[PDB]
């Protein structure tokens, strides 16, 4: 199966994309591998897929710019897209394929990446700001509060963010992001824990901007 | 090429709702279908016209008769709510055709009233010469809400950015407005209020310096 795909986060127009995609749990010799992107509308497009022996497909529309290649002792697959164009805009996902062929050929996008987001642009990476939001029980139910991270100004989409180094996941909601006027992105990710484990308990939200390569670790505290 | 495919539809729950992609360059292909829920990658649930895929329960079902195929979805639950695709392989041309996508929505889901949690800025943000009043708006149903806010009781005219609501993995929503304001624009009121009104319903949070 696909780790997350790996990418730039944004792309100049007239750039090259390029995406890393990594086998986990097993060989990236054993299948076709192929590359689908889904657009800011929810559609779908195949661009290409491949076999690590060089049987490869592309699709004609992009076949002037399109290049796919596998490395099998990095079990990796990587897809370059030159000359990118505001439609080129889109979420690129990794898969795992079926393959058939009797009296017919068939393939079948069996298991999905979770897609790597392309942004189409000419602003720069911007990294975000991270401020607590300071736990409060006066909107949560018995015993409980809200705490979270304000994670301001950054672009491109998205930020990842974990609590606890990913100890803490019951009662996580990340919010989708604003944009704003200016063109950056912010959001909030809140936290609803046990009022009595504000003592006793920690809690960091780690917050990974990888197009910036920035990241944070912050405490929140009442 | 994208294959043809059904208009979004609406299916009371228990019904049955068919789905169905179609095309010249269809023909006798075998037709996978793939489903999209918010929040997830997609998933394969048909494959070769017919074969349930694992974790396809047996109220989904696939078949194909001449350049139509059709998914037909038995005893319909709001879990199945999401979008459809349709896929088929053309080894004459060597390409991937998919269909257009199609919009499930299940009918007769309850009303879902918002939570409502205002955040007031951080002592750090203030210190770094700004600050932003959060409030957060989550599982409402259905995905519309209107979104005001006050400084003390005037109406808030400048400053305000909101999402638009987001569907999430419930099936209800989300939505979150921020309130940028100098630090002196927040002390200098007695409070500022978020007010989210919701079919009709209203909540207002308040938080003072």
């Known amino acids: 199966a696909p780790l997350p795909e790996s990418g730039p986060g944004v792309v100049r127009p007239t750039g090259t994309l390029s995406l890393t995609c990594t086998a986990a749990?097993?060989?990236?010799?054993?299948?076709?591998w192929g590359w689908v992107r889904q657009s800011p509308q929810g559609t779908l497009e195949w661009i290409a897929h491949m076999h690590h022996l060089g049987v490869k497909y592309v699709n004609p529309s992009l076949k002037n710019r399109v290049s796919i290649s596998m490395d099998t002792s990095k079990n990796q697959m990587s897809l370059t897209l030159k000359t990118v164009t505001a439609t080129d805009a889109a979420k690129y996902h990794c898969?795992?394929?079926?393959?058939?062929?009797?009296?017919?050929?068939?393939?079948?996008?069996?298991?999905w990446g979770p897609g790597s987001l392309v942004t189409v642009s000419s602003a720069s990476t911007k990294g975000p700001s991270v401020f607590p939001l300071a736990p409060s029980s006066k909107s949560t139910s018995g015993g409980t509060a809200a705490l979270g991270c304000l994670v301001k100004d950054y672009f491109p989409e998205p930020v990842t963010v974990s609590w606890n180094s990913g100890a803490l996941t019951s009662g996580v909601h990340t919010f989708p992001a604003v944009l704003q006027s200016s063109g950056l992105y912010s959001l909030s990710s809140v936290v609803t824990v046990p009022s009595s484990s504000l003592g006793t308990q920690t809690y960091i939200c780690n917050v990974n901007h990888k197009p910036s390569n920035t990241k944070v670790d912050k405490r929140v505290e009442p | 090429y994208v294959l043809g495919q059904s208009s979004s539809m609406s299916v009371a729950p228990g019904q049955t709702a068919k789905i169905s992609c179609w095309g010249y360059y269809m023909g006798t292909k075998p037709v996978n279908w793939y489903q999209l829920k918010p929040g997830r990658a997609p998933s394969l649930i048909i494959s070769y016209d017919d074969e349930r895929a694992s974790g396809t329960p047996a109220r989904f079902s696939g078949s194909h008769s001449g350049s139509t195929a059709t998914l037909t979805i038995s005893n319909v639950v709001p879990a199945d709510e999401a979008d459809y695709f349709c896929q088929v392989w053309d080894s004459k041309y060597e390409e991937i055709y998919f269909g257009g996508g199609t919009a499930l929505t299940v009918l007769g889901q309850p009303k879902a009233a918002p939570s409502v949690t205002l955040f007031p800025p951080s002592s750090e943000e203030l210190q770094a010469n700004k600050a932003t009043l959060v409030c957060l708006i989550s599982d409402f149903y259905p995905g519309a809400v209107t979104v005001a806010w006050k400084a003390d009781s005037s109406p808030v005219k400048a400053g305000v950015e909101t999402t638009t609501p987001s569907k999430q993995s419930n099936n209800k929503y989300a939505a979150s407005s921020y309130l940028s304001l100098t630090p002196e624009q927040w002390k200098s009121h007695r409070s500022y209020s978020c007010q989210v009104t919701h079919e009709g319903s209203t909540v207002e949070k308040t938080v003072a310096p």
């Open positions: 749990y097993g060989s990236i010799s054993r299948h076709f």
């Open positions: 898969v795992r394929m079926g393959a058939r062929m009797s009296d017919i050929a068939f393939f079948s996008f069996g298991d």
